[PDB]
């Protein structure tokens, strides 16, 4: 299932995201297991906080933290866990956590998939309230898990996101 | 996953349907990808209209439009996206669209799976309001997608549905 | 998908459960098909009663009734159908039904997965109201399916559950 | 609020029902308090069983058990708790419980309110599965509440329902 | 309840809306009855189409069609039926229907109530996709109700909305 | 509606709570308006965080902050907004905020209303994870509202809660 999904049709700008956690879903963290082909319950979020947007990853990538590149996907309705969406980048949230330096990409679907998000051209177009909610979420969601912490550094743009994707694809292939 | 699901236990009357879109689900069109083994987000429905009944397809079939035979499955509660249900035909909705002549089968589960639908013996037994809602849905759901259109021609019965299934199974096998 | 999920990381006490039916889900019984890699609609529950806790099975097991060992998993929020959760046993509900002697294990997730259930150390710690609801459910849910019946015998503890798991793993391997 | 809602526009055949418990709602029994003008939590259903159809009462009535006449209202989608629906009778379920002889009317909305239920002309038109689910519900829902019990006697028709309504209206007015 | 809610704190620009139908709610049309103080089920929408945004009215107003001024309220999450929200106008949708000339105001909450909508300053700021969905909804939702019809004429701005409100308040007071 | 609900049947230990915000509801803060008899949208929570348990107030009370005594009510399923529940105290969360010293009572329903919570005899019986989630919620939910802040001081017991209730009832009556 998940192991054979291509990273993208035209990398780094046209990529695929496998959704693990739908926007506003009950506060349970799922992770795709490529060895099993199934979603695995990773943990119940200690704070009970919910992801404000859909969350997943780009298959066939390997980031600096040893996991695939993570992506937040903004949509008008939450997406199905375990589904795949063709996406494009808006920017990224830069942070550091227990696993090391971490970044989360921010994306929306391909314009033909989601005409509703077509006017979001970069992270600057995302409403301030939603960016603030995403930052707050990452700063606070691990507050009740011992030995885990998150410091948010700031936002970066589409170019930074593309570098993350290209690096991830290359790292995966050895 | 989806690629190895048989078309049916006793074709054309006893067939399997892989569900893509649950009844009354939020207006997001998913499509099963047999190359990936996963549901893919095809598009956000422009009108925001929801499928009034469950929607999916019969695996190992190839219809005249180049896709597997499509099926609407009537149930008392919506079915899980990506699940498989053993079904029987009631009839079909005949239409034409941008891909060419299209028909949608109407089905219910096997009587042992869903005793609640056992007294629905043909499309004539389906309540008029629900048939009207299904027709309205197909006539209007693509109203905000440029270059797409649908003209509904009428309803046909179980014999027509069985022909669609037998043709689809044969076309698939070459 | 389901066919290659290990029975557990450290059997019988540290095992995996594939979820078929989320707690409080609409009253539709799904079963994982290892030949298809998908959930199949088994039946609409005649009484319309819902599982009061999540329900699934341990893969790579074969119980006395010819199916894998069944497990009820208690969680603060319902789990996704088709997901896998790392679990530990609290005890089991002993019963007899049309397939013969049947037992249902009662489990919670691994403490690192679900800190919320960490203080549930055995079936005696589960609230009386919930145990009573589970017993009532199994006694009554098949009341409107001809030729099916269930007599609940009583609860047993963690040792009994571990025997069921070890027996199931051995039976599966021949 | 509830105290001034008329029993009906043309009694006993054209009556109003104040909804207390929506179909398939979480298993919490609400009761309208005419002294407060609000819904009050009466009890959490011990068995966790849900009302299979909407449940409420006809205001300005007093039945033999000291409460207003109770009504089950069948609809395609659940109704809002505390809302009022114009309804017509299909029949009634006769039973006895701890409060004494009790009957529950079965109704659908006025045909102009709900065209979907217009072809339900009496209790004989209601699907057997749904009647069986309603009977099962009343026989079992109080199974875990000490000192409470229910014996279902059978179904009766529209004439019996009209007698219940006329008697209730008269009893209320002294 | 509803009869004593003021039309607004500072009319016509700062007004109150009583919500009848939450955004994306199941397709049941409720109407507030000021004589009863309760929501009444008006009808099940024949097409099964859902309001794409919250819908209600300004109390203590009387429009040209004999009902209070109607308002669509855009929010990030649907609002409770029967709740009251402090709102401001963005514009209005002009149409004609069976009751005569009708207009629907478009509004968002007061900026202190909903900071998320604060950057919506007029109807021109509302995304095109959402305006198109609202127009489509009103053009099509009555398609299966005999003798009812709707022709959409176009959008107008904040000044037109304010005129509707001032006229409505004056008409109500005699 | 709300203005005539008694503070309790036997104060301070047997009191009534009017629910404003159901557990896990979408992050919209409603407040009961006794002048209107309706729930009013107070604000959309800036952080998007949800109340982890039901939230409301005791009518006919006036606390030190100028509002009625606030109460968190723990239940197995969320309660309806605007409903009334007969409750008993477990303790209280002591804090300070922009309005001054504030305390939130913690309660469960009367044992006959909710047998499921009958073994919760004080705040010490509430699971640690849930107490931690409640504390986290109050510390963080106002993080994105300018000029608002919350410092949590600690938990207190049933005696402290009873003092809050008795003081509130007395303050209300002049
Ligand atoms: K490229
Ligand atoms: K055949
Ligand atoms: K072991
Ligand atoms: K009459
Ligand atoms: K003014
Ligand atoms: K007392
Ligand atoms: Na990561
Ligand atoms: Na097709
Ligand atoms: Na079994
Ligand atoms: Na009664
Ligand atoms: Na109007
Ligand atoms: Na307060």
Cα separations (Å) of D108 from B130, D11, E168? 17, 15, 36
CATH no. for residue C140?
A: 3.90.80.10
Contact C118/A at CB under 8 A: no
Q: With the C-alpha atoms ordered B32, B37, B41, B42, is the resulting torsion angle positive or negative?
A: negative
Phi, psi (deg, nearest 5) at residue B142:
-95, 15
Give me the number of domains chain A comprises.
Answer: 1
Distance CA A55, CA A45 (A): 14
D137-141 — which CB contacts under 8 Å span 24+ positions? D137/C48, D137/D49, D137/D51, D137/D52, D138/D93, D138/D95, D138/D104, D140/C136, D140/C140, D140/C143, D140/D47, D140/D49, D141/D45, D141/D47, D141/D49
The closest alpha carbon to D48, from F77, E82, B39, F47, belongs to F77
Give the burial class of D73: count Cβ atoms within 10 A of its Cβ; 0-12 exposed, 13-18 middle, 19 or more buried.
buried
All residues of chain F having their beta carbon less than 8 Å from the beta carbon of residue C116 are: 127, 129-130
Among left, alpha and beta (phi > 0; psi -120 to 50; other), residue B37 is left
Distance CA E139, CA E161 (A): 20
Among left, alpha and beta (phi > 0; psi -120 to 50; other), residue D136 is alpha
Contact yes or no for F115 and C129 at CB 8 A: yes
* Tokens coding D2: 């509830």
Q: Around Cβ B123, how many Cβ atoms within 10 Å?
A: 20
For E4-83, strand residue ranges (E) read 15-21, 28-33, 38-44, 54-57, 70-73
Contact B116/C at CB under 8 A: yes
Distance CA D39, CA E18 (A): 20
**Ligand 1 mean position, distance from CA A58 (Å):** 15
> Measured between alpha carbons, how far apart are the two ends of chain C, in Å?
22
Distance CA A33, CA A41 (A): 10
Data resolution in angstroms:
1.8
DSSP letters, C11-31, are TTTBEEEEEEE-TT--SEEEE
Cis status, amide bond into B49, omega within 30 of 0: no
Q: How far from the centroid of its chain's Cα atoms is residue F42's Cα?
A: 16
B-chain residue closest to E135, CA distance = B47
Whats the size of chain F, residue-wise?
A: 174
**Ligand 5 mean position, distance from CA C141 (Å):** 61
Cα separations (Å) of A135 from A51, A52, B114, F133? 11, 10, 47, 19
DSSP letters, chain B, are -GGGS-S-SBTTTBEEEEEEE-TT--SEEEEEETTTTEEEEEEE-TT----SSEEEE-TT---TTSSPPEEEE--SSPPPTT-EEEEEEEEEEEEEETTEEEEEEEEEE-TTT-GGGTT--SGGGS-HHHHHHHHHHHHHTTTTSTT--EEEEEEE-HHHHHHHHHHHHHHHT-
Contact E4/A at CB under 8 A: no
Whats the size of chain A, residue-wise?
A: 174
Distance CA F74, CA B165 (A): 54
**Ligand 4 mean position, distance from CA D77 (Å):** 28
Local structure of residue C115 (DSSP, 8 states): G
- DSSP-based three-state secondary structure for B90: strand
Are the C-beta atoms of A156 and A94 separated by less than 8 Å? yes
Distance CA A84, CA B39 (A): 6
Contact E46/D at CB under 8 A: yes
The closest alpha carbon to D51, from D152, D120, D136, belongs to D136
Cis status, amide bond into B12, omega within 30 of 0: yes
- Ligand 10 ion: residues within 5 Å (CB): D 65, 67, 70
Contact yes or no for A83 and B44 at CB 8 A: no
* Tokens coding E68: 């209070």
Local structure of residue E62 (DSSP, 8 states): -
Name the binding residues of A for Mg(2+).
65, 70, 102
D-chain residue closest to F2, CA distance = D36
Cis status, amide bond into F87, omega within 30 of 0: no
Are the C-beta atoms of A16 and A86 separated by less than 8 Å? yes
Among left, alpha and beta (phi > 0; psi -120 to 50; other), residue A134 is alpha
E-chain residue closest to A119, CA distance = E127
Q: How far from the centroid of its chain's Cα atoms is residue B150's Cα?
A: 16
All residues of chain B having their beta carbon less than 8 Å from the beta carbon of residue A2 are: 38
A-chain residue closest to E129, CA distance = A116
Q: Which residue has the tokens 């549905």?
A: B161
Distance CA A13, CA A162 (A): 7
Contact E48/B at CB under 8 A: yes
Distance CA B39, CA E47 (A): 28
Distance CA A86, CA B40 (A): 8
Contact A98/C at CB under 8 A: no
Residues of C (128-167) whose Cβ lies below 8 Å from D: 129, 132-133, 136-137, 140, 143-144
The closest alpha carbon to E114, from E137, E132, E91, E90, belongs to E90
* Smallest Cα distance from C80 to chain F, Å: 18
The residue range of the domain holding E125 is 1-174
F interface test, pick of E77, E88, E112 with most F CB neighbours within 10 Å: E77
Element (H, E) at C161: helix C158-172
Contact yes or no for C40 and B83 at CB 8 A: yes
Beta pairing partners, C60: none
The reply to whether B43 sits in an annotated binding site is yes
């Amino acid at each position: 299932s998940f192991s054979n999904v291509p990273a993208g049709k035209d990398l780094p700008q046209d990529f695929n995201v496998i959704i693990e956690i739908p926007a506003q879903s009950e506060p349970v963290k799922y992770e795709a297991d490529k060895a099993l082909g199934l979603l695995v319950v990773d943990r119940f979020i200690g704070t009970g906080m919910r992801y404000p947007v859909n969350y997943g990853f780009i298959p066939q990538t390997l980031s600096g933290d040893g996991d695939p590149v993570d992506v937040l996907v903004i949509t008008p309705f939450p997406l199905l866990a375990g589904s795949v969406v063709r996406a494009r980048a808006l920017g990224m949230l830069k942070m550091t956590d227990e696993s090391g330096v971490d970044a989360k990409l921010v994306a929306v679907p391909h314009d033909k998939v989601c005409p509703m998000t077509a006017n979001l051209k970069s992270i600057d177009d995302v409403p301030a309230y939603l960016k603030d909610q995403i930052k707050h979420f990452f700063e606070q969601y691990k507050a009740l898990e011992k030995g885990k912490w998150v410091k948010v550094e700031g936002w970066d743009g589409i170019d930074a996101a593309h570098k993350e994707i290209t690096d991830g694809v290359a790292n995966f292939k050895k």
